[PDB]
mmCIF file with all atom_site columns, N, CA and C in Angstrom:
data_model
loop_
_atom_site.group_PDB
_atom_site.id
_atom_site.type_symbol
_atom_site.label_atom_id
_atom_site.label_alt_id
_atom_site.label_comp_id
_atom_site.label_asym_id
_atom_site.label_entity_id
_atom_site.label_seq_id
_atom_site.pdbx_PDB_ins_code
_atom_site.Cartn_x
_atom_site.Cartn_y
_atom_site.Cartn_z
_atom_site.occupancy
_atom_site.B_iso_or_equiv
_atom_site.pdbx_formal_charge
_atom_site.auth_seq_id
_atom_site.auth_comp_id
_atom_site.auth_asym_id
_atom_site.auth_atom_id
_atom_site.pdbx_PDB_model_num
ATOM 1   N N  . UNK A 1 1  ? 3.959  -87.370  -10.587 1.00 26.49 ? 1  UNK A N  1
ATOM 2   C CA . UNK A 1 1  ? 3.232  -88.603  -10.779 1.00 26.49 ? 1  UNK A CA 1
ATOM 3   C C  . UNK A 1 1  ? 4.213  -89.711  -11.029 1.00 26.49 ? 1  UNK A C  1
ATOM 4   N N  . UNK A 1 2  ? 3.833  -90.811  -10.281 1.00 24.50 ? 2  UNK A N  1
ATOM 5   C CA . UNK A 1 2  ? 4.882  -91.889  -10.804 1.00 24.50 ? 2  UNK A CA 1
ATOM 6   C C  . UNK A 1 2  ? 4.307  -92.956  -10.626 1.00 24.50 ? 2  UNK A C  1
ATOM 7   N N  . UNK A 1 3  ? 4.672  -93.092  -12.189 1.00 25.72 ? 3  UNK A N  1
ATOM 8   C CA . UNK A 1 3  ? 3.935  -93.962  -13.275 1.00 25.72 ? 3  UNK A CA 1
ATOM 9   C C  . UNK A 1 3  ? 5.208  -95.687  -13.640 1.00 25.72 ? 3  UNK A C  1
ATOM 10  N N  . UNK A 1 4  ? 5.022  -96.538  -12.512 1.00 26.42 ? 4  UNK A N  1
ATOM 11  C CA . UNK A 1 4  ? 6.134  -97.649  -12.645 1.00 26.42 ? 4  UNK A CA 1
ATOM 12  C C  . UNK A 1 4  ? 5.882  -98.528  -13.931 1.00 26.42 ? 4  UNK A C  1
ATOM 13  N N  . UNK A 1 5  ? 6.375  -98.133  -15.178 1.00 26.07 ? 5  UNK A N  1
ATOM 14  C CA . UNK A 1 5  ? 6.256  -99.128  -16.248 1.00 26.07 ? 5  UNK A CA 1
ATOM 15  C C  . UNK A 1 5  ? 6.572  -100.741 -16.166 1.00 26.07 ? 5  UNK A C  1
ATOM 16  N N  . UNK A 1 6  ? 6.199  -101.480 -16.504 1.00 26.61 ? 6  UNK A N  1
ATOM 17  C CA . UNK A 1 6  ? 6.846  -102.994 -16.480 1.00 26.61 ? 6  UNK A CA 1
ATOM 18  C C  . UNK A 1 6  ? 7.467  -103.013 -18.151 1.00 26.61 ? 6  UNK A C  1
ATOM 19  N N  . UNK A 1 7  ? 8.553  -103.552 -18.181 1.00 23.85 ? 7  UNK A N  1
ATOM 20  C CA . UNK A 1 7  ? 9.285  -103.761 -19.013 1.00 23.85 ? 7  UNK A CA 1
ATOM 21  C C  . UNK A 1 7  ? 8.545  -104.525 -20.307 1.00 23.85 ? 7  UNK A C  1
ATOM 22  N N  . UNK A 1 8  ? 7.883  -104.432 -21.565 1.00 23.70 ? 8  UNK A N  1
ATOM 23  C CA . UNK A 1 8  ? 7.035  -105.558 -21.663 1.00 23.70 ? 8  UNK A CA 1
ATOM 24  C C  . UNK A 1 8  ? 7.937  -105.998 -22.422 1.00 23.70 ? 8  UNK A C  1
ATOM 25  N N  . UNK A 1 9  ? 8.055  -107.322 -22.171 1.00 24.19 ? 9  UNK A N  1
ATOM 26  C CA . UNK A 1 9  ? 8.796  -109.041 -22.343 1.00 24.19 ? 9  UNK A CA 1
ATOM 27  C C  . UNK A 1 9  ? 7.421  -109.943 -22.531 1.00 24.19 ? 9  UNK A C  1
ATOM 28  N N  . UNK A 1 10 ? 6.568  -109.387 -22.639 1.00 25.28 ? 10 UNK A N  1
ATOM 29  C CA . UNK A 1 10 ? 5.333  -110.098 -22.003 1.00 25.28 ? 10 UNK A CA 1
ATOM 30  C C  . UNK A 1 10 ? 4.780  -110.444 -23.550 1.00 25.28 ? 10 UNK A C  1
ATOM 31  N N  . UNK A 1 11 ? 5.120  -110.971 -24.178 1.00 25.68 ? 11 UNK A N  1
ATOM 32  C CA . UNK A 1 11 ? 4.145  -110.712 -25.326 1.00 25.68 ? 11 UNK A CA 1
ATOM 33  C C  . UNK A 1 11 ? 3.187  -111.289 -25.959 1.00 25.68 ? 11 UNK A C  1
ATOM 34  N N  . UNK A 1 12 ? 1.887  -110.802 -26.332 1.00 25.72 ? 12 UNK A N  1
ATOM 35  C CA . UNK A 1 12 ? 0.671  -110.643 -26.654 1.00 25.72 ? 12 UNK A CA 1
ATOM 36  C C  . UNK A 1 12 ? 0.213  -110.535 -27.520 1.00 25.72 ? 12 UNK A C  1
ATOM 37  N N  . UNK A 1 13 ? -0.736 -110.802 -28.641 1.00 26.88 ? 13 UNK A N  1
ATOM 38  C CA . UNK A 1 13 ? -1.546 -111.282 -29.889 1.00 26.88 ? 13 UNK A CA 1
ATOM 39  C C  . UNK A 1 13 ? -1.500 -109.756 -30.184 1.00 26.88 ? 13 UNK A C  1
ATOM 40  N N  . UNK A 1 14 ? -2.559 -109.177 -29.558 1.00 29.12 ? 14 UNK A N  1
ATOM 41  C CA . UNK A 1 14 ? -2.902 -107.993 -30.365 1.00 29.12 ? 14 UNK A CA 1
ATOM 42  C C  . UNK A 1 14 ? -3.348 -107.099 -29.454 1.00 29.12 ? 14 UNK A C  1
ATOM 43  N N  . UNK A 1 15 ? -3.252 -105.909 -29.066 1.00 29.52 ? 15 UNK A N  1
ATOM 44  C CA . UNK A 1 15 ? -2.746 -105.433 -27.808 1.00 29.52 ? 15 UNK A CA 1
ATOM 45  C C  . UNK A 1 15 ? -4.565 -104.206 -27.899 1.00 29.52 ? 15 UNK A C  1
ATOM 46  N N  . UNK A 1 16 ? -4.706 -104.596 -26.416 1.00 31.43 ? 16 UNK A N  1
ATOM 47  C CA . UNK A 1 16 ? -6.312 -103.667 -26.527 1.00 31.43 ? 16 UNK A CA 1
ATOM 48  C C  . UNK A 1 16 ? -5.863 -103.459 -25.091 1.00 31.43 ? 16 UNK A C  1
ATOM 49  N N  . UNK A 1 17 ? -6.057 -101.910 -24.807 1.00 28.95 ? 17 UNK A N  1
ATOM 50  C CA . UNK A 1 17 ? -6.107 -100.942 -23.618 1.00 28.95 ? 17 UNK A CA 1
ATOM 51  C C  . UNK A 1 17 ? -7.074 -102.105 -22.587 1.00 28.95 ? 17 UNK A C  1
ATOM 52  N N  . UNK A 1 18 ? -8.201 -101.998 -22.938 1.00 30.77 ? 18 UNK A N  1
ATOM 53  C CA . UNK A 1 18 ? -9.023 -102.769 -21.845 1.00 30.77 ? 18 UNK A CA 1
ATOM 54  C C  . UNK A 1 18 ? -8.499 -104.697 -21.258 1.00 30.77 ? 18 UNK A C  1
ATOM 55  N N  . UNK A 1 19 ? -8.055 -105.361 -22.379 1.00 31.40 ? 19 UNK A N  1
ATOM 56  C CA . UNK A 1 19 ? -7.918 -106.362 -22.381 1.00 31.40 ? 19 UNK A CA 1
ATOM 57  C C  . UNK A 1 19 ? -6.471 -106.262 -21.572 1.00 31.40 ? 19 UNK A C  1
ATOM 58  N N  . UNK A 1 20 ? -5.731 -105.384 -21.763 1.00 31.79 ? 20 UNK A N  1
ATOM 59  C CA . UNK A 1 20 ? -4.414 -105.037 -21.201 1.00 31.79 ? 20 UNK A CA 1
ATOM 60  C C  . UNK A 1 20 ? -4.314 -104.956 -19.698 1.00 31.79 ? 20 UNK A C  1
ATOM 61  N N  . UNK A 1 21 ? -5.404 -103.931 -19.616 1.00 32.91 ? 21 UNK A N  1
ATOM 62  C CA . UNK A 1 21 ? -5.585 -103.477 -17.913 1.00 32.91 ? 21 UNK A CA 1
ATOM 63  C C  . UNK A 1 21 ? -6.157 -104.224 -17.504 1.00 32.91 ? 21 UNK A C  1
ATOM 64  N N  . UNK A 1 22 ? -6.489 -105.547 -17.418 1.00 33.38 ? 22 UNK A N  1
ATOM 65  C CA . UNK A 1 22 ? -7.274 -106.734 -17.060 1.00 33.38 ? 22 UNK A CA 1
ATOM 66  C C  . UNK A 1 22 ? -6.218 -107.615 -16.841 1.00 33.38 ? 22 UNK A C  1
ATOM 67  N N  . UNK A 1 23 ? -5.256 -107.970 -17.894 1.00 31.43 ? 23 UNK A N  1
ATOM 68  C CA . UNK A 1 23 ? -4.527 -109.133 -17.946 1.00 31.43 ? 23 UNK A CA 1
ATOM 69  C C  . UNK A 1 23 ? -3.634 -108.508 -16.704 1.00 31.43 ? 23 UNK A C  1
ATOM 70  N N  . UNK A 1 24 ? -2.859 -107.519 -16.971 1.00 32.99 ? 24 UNK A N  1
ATOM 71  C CA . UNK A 1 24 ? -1.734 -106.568 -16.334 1.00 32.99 ? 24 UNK A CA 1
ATOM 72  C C  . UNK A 1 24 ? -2.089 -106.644 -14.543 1.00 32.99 ? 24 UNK A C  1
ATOM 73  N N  . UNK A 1 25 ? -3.184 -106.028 -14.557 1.00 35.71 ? 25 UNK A N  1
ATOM 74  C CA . UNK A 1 25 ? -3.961 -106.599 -12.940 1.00 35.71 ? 25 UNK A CA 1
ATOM 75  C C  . UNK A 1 25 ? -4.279 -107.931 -12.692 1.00 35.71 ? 25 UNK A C  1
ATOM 76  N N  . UNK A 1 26 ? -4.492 -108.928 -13.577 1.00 34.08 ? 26 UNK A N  1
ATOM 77  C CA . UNK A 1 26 ? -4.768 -109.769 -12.763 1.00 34.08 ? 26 UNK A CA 1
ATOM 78  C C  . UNK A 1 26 ? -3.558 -110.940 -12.755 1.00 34.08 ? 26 UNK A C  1
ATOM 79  N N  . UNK A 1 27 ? -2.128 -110.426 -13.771 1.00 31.90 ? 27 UNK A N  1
ATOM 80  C CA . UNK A 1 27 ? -1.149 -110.492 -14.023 1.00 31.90 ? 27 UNK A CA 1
ATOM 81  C C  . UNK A 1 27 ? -0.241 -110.744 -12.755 1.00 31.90 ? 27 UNK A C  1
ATOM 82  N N  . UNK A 1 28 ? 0.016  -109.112 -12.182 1.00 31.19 ? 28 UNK A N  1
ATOM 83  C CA . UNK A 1 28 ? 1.355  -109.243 -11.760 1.00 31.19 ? 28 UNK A CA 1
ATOM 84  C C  . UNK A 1 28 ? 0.875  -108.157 -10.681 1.00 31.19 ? 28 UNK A C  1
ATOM 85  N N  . UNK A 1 29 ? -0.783 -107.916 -10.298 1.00 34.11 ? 29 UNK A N  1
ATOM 86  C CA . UNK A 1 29 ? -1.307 -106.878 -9.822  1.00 34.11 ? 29 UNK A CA 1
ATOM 87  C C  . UNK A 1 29 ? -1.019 -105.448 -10.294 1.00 34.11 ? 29 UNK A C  1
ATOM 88  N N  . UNK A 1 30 ? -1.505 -105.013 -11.605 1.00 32.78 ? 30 UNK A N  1
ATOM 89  C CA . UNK A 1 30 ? -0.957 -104.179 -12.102 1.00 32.78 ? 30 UNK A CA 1
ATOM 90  C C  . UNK A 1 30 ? -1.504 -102.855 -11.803 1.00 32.78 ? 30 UNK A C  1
ATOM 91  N N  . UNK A 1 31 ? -1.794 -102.040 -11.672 1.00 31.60 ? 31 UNK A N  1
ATOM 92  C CA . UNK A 1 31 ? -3.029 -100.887 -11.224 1.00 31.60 ? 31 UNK A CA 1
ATOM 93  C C  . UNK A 1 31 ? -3.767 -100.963 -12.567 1.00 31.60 ? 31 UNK A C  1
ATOM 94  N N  . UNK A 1 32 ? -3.071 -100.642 -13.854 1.00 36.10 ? 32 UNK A N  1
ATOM 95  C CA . UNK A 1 32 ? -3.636 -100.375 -14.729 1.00 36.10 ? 32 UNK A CA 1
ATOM 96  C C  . UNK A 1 32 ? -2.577 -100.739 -16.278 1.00 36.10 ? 32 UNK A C  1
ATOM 97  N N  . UNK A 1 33 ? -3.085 -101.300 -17.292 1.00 36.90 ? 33 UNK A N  1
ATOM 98  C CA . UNK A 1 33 ? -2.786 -101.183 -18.410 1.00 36.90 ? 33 UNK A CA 1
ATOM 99  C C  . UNK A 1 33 ? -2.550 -100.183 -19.568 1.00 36.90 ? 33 UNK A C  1
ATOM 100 N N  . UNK A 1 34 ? -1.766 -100.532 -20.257 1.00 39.30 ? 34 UNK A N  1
ATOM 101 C CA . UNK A 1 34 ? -1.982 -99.231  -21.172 1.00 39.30 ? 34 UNK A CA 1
ATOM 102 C C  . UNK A 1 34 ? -0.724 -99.935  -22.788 1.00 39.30 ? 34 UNK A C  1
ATOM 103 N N  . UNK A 1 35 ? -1.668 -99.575  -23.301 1.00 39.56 ? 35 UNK A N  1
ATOM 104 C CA . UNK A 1 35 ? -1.246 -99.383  -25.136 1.00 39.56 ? 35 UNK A CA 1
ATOM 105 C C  . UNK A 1 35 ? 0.176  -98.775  -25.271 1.00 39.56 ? 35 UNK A C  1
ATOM 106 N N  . UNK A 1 36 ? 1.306  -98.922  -25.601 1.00 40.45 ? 36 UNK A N  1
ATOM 107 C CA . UNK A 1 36 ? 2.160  -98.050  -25.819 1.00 40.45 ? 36 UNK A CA 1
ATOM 108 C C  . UNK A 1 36 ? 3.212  -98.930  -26.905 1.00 40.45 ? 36 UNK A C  1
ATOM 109 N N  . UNK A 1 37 ? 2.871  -98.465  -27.919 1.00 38.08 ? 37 UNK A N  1
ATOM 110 C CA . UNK A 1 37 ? 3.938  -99.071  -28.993 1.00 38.08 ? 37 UNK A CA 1
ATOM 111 C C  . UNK A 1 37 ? 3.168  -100.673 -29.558 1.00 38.08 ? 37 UNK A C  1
ATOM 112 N N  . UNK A 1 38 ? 1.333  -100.786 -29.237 1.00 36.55 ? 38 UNK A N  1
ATOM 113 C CA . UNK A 1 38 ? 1.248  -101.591 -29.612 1.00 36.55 ? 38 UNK A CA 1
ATOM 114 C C  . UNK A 1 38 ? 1.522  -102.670 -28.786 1.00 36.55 ? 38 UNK A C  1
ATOM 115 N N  . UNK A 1 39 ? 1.971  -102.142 -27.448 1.00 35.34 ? 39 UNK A N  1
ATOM 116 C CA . UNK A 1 39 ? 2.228  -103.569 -26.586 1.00 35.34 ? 39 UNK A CA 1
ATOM 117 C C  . UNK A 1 39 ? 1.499  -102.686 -25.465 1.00 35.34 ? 39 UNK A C  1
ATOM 118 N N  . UNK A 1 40 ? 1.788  -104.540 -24.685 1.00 37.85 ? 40 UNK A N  1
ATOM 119 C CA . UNK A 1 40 ? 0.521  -103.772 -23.698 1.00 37.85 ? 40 UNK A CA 1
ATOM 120 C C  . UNK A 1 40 ? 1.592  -103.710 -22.628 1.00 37.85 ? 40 UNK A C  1
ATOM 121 N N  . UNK A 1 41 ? 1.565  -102.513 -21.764 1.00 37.46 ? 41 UNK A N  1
ATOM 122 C CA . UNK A 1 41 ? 2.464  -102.223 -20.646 1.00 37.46 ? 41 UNK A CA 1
ATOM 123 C C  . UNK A 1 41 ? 1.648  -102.069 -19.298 1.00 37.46 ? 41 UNK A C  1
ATOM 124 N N  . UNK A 1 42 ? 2.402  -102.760 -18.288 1.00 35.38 ? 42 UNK A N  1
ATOM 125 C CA . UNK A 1 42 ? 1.657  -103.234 -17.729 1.00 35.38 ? 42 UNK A CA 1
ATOM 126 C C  . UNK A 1 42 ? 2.377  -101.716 -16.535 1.00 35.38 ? 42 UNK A C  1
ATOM 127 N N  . UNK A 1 43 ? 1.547  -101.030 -15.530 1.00 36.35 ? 43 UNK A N  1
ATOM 128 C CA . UNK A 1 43 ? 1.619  -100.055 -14.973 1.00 36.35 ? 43 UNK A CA 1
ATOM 129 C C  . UNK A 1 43 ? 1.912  -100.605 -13.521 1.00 36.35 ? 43 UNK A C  1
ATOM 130 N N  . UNK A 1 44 ? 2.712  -100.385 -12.285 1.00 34.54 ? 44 UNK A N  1
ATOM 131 C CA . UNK A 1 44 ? 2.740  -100.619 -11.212 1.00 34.54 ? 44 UNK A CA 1
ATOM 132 C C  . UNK A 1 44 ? 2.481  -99.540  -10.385 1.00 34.54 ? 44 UNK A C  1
ATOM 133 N N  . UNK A 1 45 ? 2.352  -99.669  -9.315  1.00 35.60 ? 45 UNK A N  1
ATOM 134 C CA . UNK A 1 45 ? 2.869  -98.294  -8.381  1.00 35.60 ? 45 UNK A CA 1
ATOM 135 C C  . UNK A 1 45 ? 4.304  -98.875  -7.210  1.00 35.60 ? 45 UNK A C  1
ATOM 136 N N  . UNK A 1 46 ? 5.070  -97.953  -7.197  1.00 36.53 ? 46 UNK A N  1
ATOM 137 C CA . UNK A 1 46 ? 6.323  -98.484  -6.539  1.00 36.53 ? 46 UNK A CA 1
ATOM 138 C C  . UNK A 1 46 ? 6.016  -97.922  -5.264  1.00 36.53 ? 46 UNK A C  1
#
């Protein structure tokens, strides 16, 4: 599985899975968001 992390530099109030995978896609076209460390990481596919 390969899972392209984005570096997060990105930073954000207060970090919610759903609000993440929203911003992240409509961001930088992200597939999907995700929680990790409290930040929101934004998922690509390479």
């Amino acid at each position: 599985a390969k899972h392209c992390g984005k570096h997060s530099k990105s930073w954000n109030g207060k970090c919610f899975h759903k609000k993440c995978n929203h911003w992240c896609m409509e961001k930088e076209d992200a597939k999907y968001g995700s929680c990790s460390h409290g930040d929101c990481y934004c998922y690509y596919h390479c």
